[PDB]
Design a binder for this molecule. Structure first.
Ligand SMILES: *[C@@H]1O[C@H](CO[C@H]2O[C@@H](C)[C@@H](O)[C@@H](O)[C@@H]2O)[C@@H](O[C@@H]2O[C@H](CO)[C@@H](O)[C@H](O)[C@H]2NC(C)=O)[C@H](O)[C@H]1NC(C)=O
Ligand SMILES: *[C@@H]1O[C@H](CO[C@H]2O[C@@H](C)[C@@H](O)[C@@H](O)[C@@H]2O)[C@@H](O[C@@H]2O[C@H](CO)[C@@H](O)[C@H](O)[C@H]2NC(C)=O)[C@H](O)[C@H]1NC(C)=O
Ligand SMILES: *[C@@H]1O[C@H](CO[C@H]2O[C@@H](C)[C@@H](O)[C@@H](O)[C@@H]2O)[C@@H](O[C@@H]2O[C@H](CO)[C@@H](O)[C@H](O)[C@H]2NC(C)=O)[C@H](O)[C@H]1NC(C)=O
Ligand SMILES: *[C@@H]1O[C@H](CO[C@H]2O[C@@H](C)[C@@H](O)[C@@H](O)[C@@H]2O)[C@@H](O[C@@H]2O[C@H](CO)[C@@H](O)[C@H](O)[C@H]2NC(C)=O)[C@H](O)[C@H]1NC(C)=O
Ligand SMILES: *[C@@H]1O[C@H](CO[C@H]2O[C@@H](C)[C@@H](O)[C@@H](O)[C@@H]2O)[C@@H](O)[C@H](O)[C@H]1NC(C)=O
Ligand SMILES: *[C@@H]1O[C@H](CO[C@H]2O[C@@H](C)[C@@H](O)[C@@H](O)[C@@H]2O)[C@@H](O)[C@H](O)[C@H]1NC(C)=O
Ligand SMILES: *[C@@H]1O[C@H](CO)[C@@H](O)[C@H](O)[C@H]1NC(C)=O
Ligand SMILES: *[C@@H]1O[C@H](CO)[C@@H](O)[C@H](O)[C@H]1NC(C)=O
Ligand SMILES: *[C@@H]1O[C@H](CO)[C@@H](O)[C@H](O)[C@H]1NC(C)=O
Ligand SMILES: *[C@@H]1O[C@H](CO)[C@@H](O)[C@H](O)[C@H]1NC(C)=O
Ligand SMILES: *[C@H]1O[C@H](CO)[C@@H](O)[C@H](O)[C@H]1NC(C)=O
Ligand SMILES: *[C@H]1O[C@H](CO)[C@@H](O)[C@H](O)[C@H]1NC(C)=O
Ligand SMILES: *[P@@](=O)(NCCC)OCC
Ligand SMILES: *[P@@](=O)(NCCC)OCC
Ligand SMILES: [Cl-]
Ligand SMILES: [Cl-]
Ligand SMILES: [Cl-]
Ligand SMILES: [Cl-]
Ligand SMILES: [Cl-]
Ligand SMILES: [Cl-]
Ligand code: NA
Lengths: 527, 527
């Protein structure tokens, strides 16, 4: 029976047999006052503190959010939907510790992605007990507010200042600073890690001064704040806050009145209108995201990046080989998970309309021009592959590569990887390739579980990834030093070396997507 | 009607329509006195010279040689068998010129391979009219003596000095020096090119002082003289010459007597005994090859290489991705072109006995040890792939890579490629992959012929290869400069960069076969 006392009270955990060993899980420890009522839309507040013993023996509620109902009964999509009740009262974190209680363990803190509109730390692919069993690190993850309830902004106004969910992430990192040594953790060795919006989040904590002393290093999976979906301009943010006001009949004249009104609507009604705060939208819409609030984020982050203002420490950044594929079956004419989606040229053109809504005609032709001159005009899946590349390179790959270059230029070691293994168990079709989100399970160690139908080659890839990640976290270098592994070079502006992750040989290459990111990065931002 | 006058007489050629254009072929021009009778086994002699007009309107005889009868009726193998009568009277070359007659063309001279035991310049895959049509270079190729009749040695004795066929190659390069300007050629711009034994040959002309001024630059396809099959030690050479003497009842006491005897045997009888001049032999045997004769080759070539004694000029070297596969179906138990050859561990071990005949037991285990510890023990074709790699890396890849490093260390630009396209028309089975010999057709331009059932992607690959090769030859740099092509770095000792050739994207990589050539190159030579 395992009780540990925290600044805020006592908590009891639960024992778990993992790979003939034991890990102790403390699931659902709260970490702020629930943000209800007068608290809805505001920065998270001090956890007040309990006598008695909190039982942290189940996952807690997920924050309120819309669910994906595009493919009901389909594991591919439904594995991302929340798997505990939704509730405004959702500010809880989990801790996983090795048994016996370690003495001064390195801490991995996961930030889930979800477009800032969705996600929960209790997904199966985010289970921290393999890491803690196998590398005897500690693993912490947090639920943070998503959608309007976490990122609604009316700037300057503390009733709705913006970035609420980013400060919930922040107050969780404070909670580990204050409390983790009690579970055996080293607060001086914390690595943040995250995927997609959770990676974007990690990147902004690197820019945020209030985070600067709550962690040591950073991992960025398929995401960084300079991605085009990751930050909302102050313009659009008020437009959206007021479009929301409109839609819930809350338009007012006093702005503390709009908020006061909005703080009365039921959850379902805010959720139900989020999708429409915006005229055209796309499968990659982020209607309520991070903003420059003068508080968490003191200036446009692209400026802060360029001018070297951010935490100086090492970063590990990566992307998957087919990032863009997963979003095509949510709206691009011709695309299906249930056939092979050979689309035509005219369909590709229509696709650009779905993905690049407004979006000058010359903008769109220039993408066509870049992506459709091939070698050669023969192959039927030419147009199908090109549209996935537009979307991967634009939305994820080129921005992760430019973050890493700008970041490495100021001095610190960075490592870049290029993940290209397709999971033997992937439920989406072949044509969709090495999809977005599908490294997560390798990073968390799921394939180490033999009982589970992954290949030998996959267990091996996983065991090695897990060791590189845990070496980065403790040592700032992601090598696997024992099993004659390919050495992972640092990424520099100049040679731009990266390491490829696959079940066969892993290689050192140079200048991923060189010709394509020259398009996205220098020319496109102009159209 | 196209006549051109040469130092030795006049010759008439023939016109050919190629790709809506015309090339002029002069096939079978003789280039030495036929080596018959008193000449058999001796260096080639001065072409004496004719009035009248030689018609060079057909390919001439191939030199005497054994044929491959392993797969009668099979195109895979039979495409390599000679396709004009065999005859001792076989010292002829072909010239292909663009029409209109160029003014000062660069000259490509092909040296065919064939293990030094076989081959002929009239194979279809060696047809020089695409190169001449498309790049308006001139292409010359020569028949040279192979097998005992070209490489029999009894050292010091001019009746059989060794290396006869290497001096036939040499006298052909002299013939181009003397005569090519008449066909429109620049004798100051000659590139030698060759595959397997023909590449080994090219490499030794780089070491041979008598060749040093008969050419400008060198191309090495799947071959170099430091390959383990490419040079015969003086020991084994006399053993073999006398074993041959024995076997044809010619053992004598006077050595000019053994030769005088041997010069009486019919061709078929020498050919018929070549295979047995040697106790164990292997699918890669070279019973009669180059030797250090004190004439063409003044010292062990490994010493000459190490100590920087060789023509200083640029080299382009390459290997195919599955070099070793083709030789497994000639003797390795379990292997077949007609099934997928999943062999067992015990079969692999037996395979090493076939390929590494004598061959300490510890030698052989150490190869097993290097090549059979995998990731992981699951895949059934594990042993099948490993045996092809032993044979490729040992026989071709590691020695081509070490030639290029040693050569680049003295100052000159080198380029290395790694060919990894499997021909859509390959007649051998899939498991055999990107085989030895199967770049030749891309280099010669065969896929440019649309009429011929190659893919679009293949025509494109070919057109690009042809342009890189022709740029090397004229400019010493194999770039394709027009079509936004990946830039080919020079290979240096240090980064060891190479370019991959495939129908998709071509890449810059580093240190091909690093771990394997550390085995072949430092450790193995010791066993
Ligand atoms: C800022 O918001 C306005 C508001 O428009 C909207 O009203 C909201 C409640 C919501 O329902 C939304 O879907 C609706 O469009 C946007 O104005 C609209 O723009 C489009 C094209 O520009 C027109 O066809 C609409 O008729 C127009 N609506 C109104 C009522 O004016 C405005 O576009 C937006 N800014 C951006 C850049 O997206
Ligand atoms: C692959 O499927 C797409 C997806 O749309 C369909 O899903 C199919 C399996 C189909 O049977 C039907 O149930 C559903 O609409 C097919 O494209 C569709 O084709 C029609 C013309 O019938 C369009 O007007 C539809 O809107 C269009 N769907 C989309 C997403 O735009 C696509 O044709 C199919 N192609 C194949 C088999 O190669
Ligand atoms: C140098 O040659 C000798 C000669 O042996 C051979 O006689 C030749 C005419 C030819 O027919 C050949 O196949 C035959 O073997 C080699 O000697 C032989 O070596 C093996 C094993 O070492 C024995 O089993 C043989 O009995 C023996 N033969 C004789 C007649 O002595 C010798 O091996 C060779 N050198 C090398 C290194 O290959
Ligand atoms: C793949 O074929 C090899 C090759 O040998 C055979 O070719 C076959 C297609 C076969 O039917 C027969 O005509 C010819 O011998 C097979 O290996 C052979 O197996 C036998 C046992 O029958 C050995 O004693 C043979 O010597 C052996 N051949 C060799 C080259 O050593 C091999 O078993 C086969 N495997 C398959 C189908 O996977
Ligand atoms: C636990 O270790 C403390 C500091 O360790 C870290 O140094 C940091 C700057 C960072 O590099 C981490 O990754 C290092 O591991 C030390 O000062 C504490 O006093 C220690 N307390 C213990 C051992 O219980
Ligand atoms: C033909 O060009 C002659 C030399 O050209 C070469 O220079 C060499 C050293 C080598 O680099 C080659 O690749 C160059 O192309 C020149 O001296 C002759 O006089 C020329 N004769 C003509 C134009 O008919
Ligand atoms: C907390 O859980 C323990 C463990 O069995 C139990 O003994 C205790 O009463 C629980 N308190 C609750 C559910 O409030
Ligand atoms: C080292 O490889 C062995 C097998 O040789 C295996 O036990 C394990 O997966 C490896 N350790 C790491 C960190 O990869
Ligand atoms: C050489 O060929 C020409 C071309 O038709 C012919 O006119 C001439 O007589 C030939 N001489 C031979 C075959 O000796
Ligand atoms: C250049 O590419 C074009 C098609 O754009 C084609 O005509 C030709 O194959 C190319 N030239 C070379 C040397 O590859
Ligand atoms: C608007 O009116 C209310 C009064 O209850 C107040 O909450 C808000 O701050 C006022 N601001 C102004 C000056 O318009
Ligand atoms: C061996 O005898 C013959 C004599 O006709 C000759 O050709 C050869 O050079 C002689 N060499 C010696 C000295 O044994
Ligand atoms: P990430 O959190 N960002 C995509 C922006 C919509 O993953 C979405 C599936
Ligand atoms: P290359 O001329 N060398 C192999 C040595 C026997 O090609 C043989 C097929
Ligand atoms: Cl094509
Ligand atoms: Cl590795
Ligand atoms: Cl790329
Ligand atoms: Cl395996
Ligand atoms: Cl290219
Ligand atoms: Cl390799
Ligand atoms: Na442009």
């Amino acid at each position: 029976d395992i009780i540990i006392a925290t600044k805020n009270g006592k908590v009891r955990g639960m024992q778990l047999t993992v790979f003939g060993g034991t890990v102790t899980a403390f699931l659902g420890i709260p970490y702020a006052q629930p943000p209800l009522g007068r608290l809805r839309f505001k920065k998270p507040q001090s956890l007040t503190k309990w006598s008695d013993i909190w039982n942290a023996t189940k996952y807690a509620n997920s924050c309120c959010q819309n669910i994906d109902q595009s493919f009901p009964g389909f594991h591919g999509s439904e594995m991302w939907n929340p798997n505990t009740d939704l509730s405004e009262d959702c500010l809880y974190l989990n801790v996983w510790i090795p048994a016996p209680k370690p003495k001064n363990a390195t801490v991995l803190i996961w930030i889930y992605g979800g477009g800032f509109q969705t996600g929960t730390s209790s997904l199966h692919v985010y289970d921290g007990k393999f890491l803690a069993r196998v590398e005897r690190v500690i693993v912490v993850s947090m639920n943070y507010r998503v959608g309007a309830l976490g990122f609604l902004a009316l700037p300057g106004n503390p009733e709705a200042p913006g970035n609420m969910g980013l400060f919930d992430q922040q107050l969780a990192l404070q909670w580990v600073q204050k409390n983790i040594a009690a579970f055996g953790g080293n607060p001086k060795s914390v690595t943040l890690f995250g995927e997609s919006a959770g990676a974007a989040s990690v990147s902004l904590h690197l820019l945020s001064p209030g985070s600067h002393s709550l962690f040591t290093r950073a991992i960025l999976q398929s995401g960084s704040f300079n991605a085009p979906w990751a930050v909302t301009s102050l313009y659009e943010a008020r437009n959206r806050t007021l479009n929301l006001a409109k839609l819930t009949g809350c338009s007012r004249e006093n702005e503390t009145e709009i908020i006061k009104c909005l703080r009365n609507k039921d959850p379902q009604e805010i959720l139900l209108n989020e999708a429409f705060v915006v005229p055209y939208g796309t499968p990659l819409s982020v209607n309520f995201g991070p903003t420059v609030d003068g508080d968490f984020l003191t200036d446009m982050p692209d400026i802060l990046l360029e001018l070297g203002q951010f935490k100086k420490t090492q970063i590990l950044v990566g992307v998957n080989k087919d990032e863009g594929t997963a979003f095509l079956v949510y709206g691009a004419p011709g695309f299906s998970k249930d056939n092979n989606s050979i689309i035509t040229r005219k369909e590709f053109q229509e696709g650009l309309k779905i993905f690049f809504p407004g979006v000058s005609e010359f903008g769109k032709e220039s993408i066509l021009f870049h992506y459709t001159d091939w070698v050669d005009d023969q192959r039927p899946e030419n147009y199908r592959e090109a549209l996935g590349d537009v979307v991967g390179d634009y939305n994820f790959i080129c921005p992760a590569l430019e973050f890493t270059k700008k970041f490495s230029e100021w001095g610190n070691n960075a490592f870049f990887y290029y993940f290209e293994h397709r999971s033997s168990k992937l439920p989406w079709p072949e044509w969709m390739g090495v999809m977005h989100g599908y490294e997560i399970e390798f990073v968390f160690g799921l394939p180490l579980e033999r009982r589970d139908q992954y290949t030998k080659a996959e267990e091996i890839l996983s065991r090695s990834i897990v060791k590189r990640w845990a070496n980065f976290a403790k040592y700032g270098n992601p090598q696997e030093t024992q099993n004659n592994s390919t050495s992972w070079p640092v990424f520099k502006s100049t040679e731009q070396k990266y390491l490829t992750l696959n079940t066969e040989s892993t290689r050192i290459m140079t200048k991923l997507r060189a010709q394509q990111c020259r398009f996205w990065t220098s020319f496109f931002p102009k159209v």
